[PDB]
Amino acid sequence: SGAIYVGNYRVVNRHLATHNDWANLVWEDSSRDLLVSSTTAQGCDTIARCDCQTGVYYCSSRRKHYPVSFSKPSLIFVEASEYYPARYQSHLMLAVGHSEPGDCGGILRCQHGVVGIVSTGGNGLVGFADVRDLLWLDEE
């Protein structure tokens, strides 16, 4: 589990969105596994606007933050899960790291801010949904 809290937005994995998220929806994209809802309180996270390919992510199944090298956002085939069939997910970045399904929502960050959230996982792989292109998260 986990979310990004920037401005008056809450960014979560679409497959983990709650009823309150759907009832206060701002934007969602199944191809990216992302959903954004509105919040009453202002958040403290800032979004990275950069081209970093190194950063650190939070792994809830180890209670640890790990430094990782990650690929550029791309269209990757992901195997079936209980939330989606086997399909192509867009704006996904892969790294070598520990991951389990409940680790979705953990933040990937660099020196500039938040880069994305854990969305997928393989044997010794972790995939992150990028948010750096979502410029509108910084306003309204």
Give yes or no: 33 in active site: yes
Q: Do the strands 64-69 and 54-59 form a parallel or antiparallel pair, or are they unpaired?
A: antiparallel
Both tokens assigned to 74: 């791309």
Is 122 a residue that touches ligand A1BPD (CB under 6 A)? yes
Catalytic residue among 33, 91, 103, 130: 33
Q: Which amino acid is at 125?
A: L
Catalytic residue among 21, 59, 103, 104: 104
Q: How far apart are CA 69 and CA 82, in angstroms?
A: 28
- What lies within 8 Å, CB to CB, of 28 at 6+ separation is 14, 17, 34, 35, 36
Binding mask 70-99 for ligand A1BPD (x = CB under 6 A): --------x--x-xx----x---------x
Q: How far apart are CA 107 and CA 13, in angstroms?
A: 11
Binding mask 28-67 for Zn ion (x = CB under 5 A): --------------------x-x-x---------------
Give yes or no: 138 in active site: no
The distance of closest approach from Cβ of residue 66 to ligand A1BPD in the complex, given in angstroms and rounded to an integer, is 13
Q: Which is nearer to ligand A1BPD, 7 or 57 (CB)?
A: 57
Q: Which is nearer to ligand A1BPD, 94 or 114 (CB)?
A: 94
* Residue 91 assigned to a binding site: no
Alpha-carbon separation of residue 74 from 11, 67, 89, 90, 133 (angstroms): 20, 21, 8, 6, 13
Residue with tokens 């990757």, as numbered in its chain:
76
- In the complex, the residues that contact Zn ion under the rule CB under 5 A are 48, 50, 52, 110, 112
Catalytic residues: 15, 33, 104
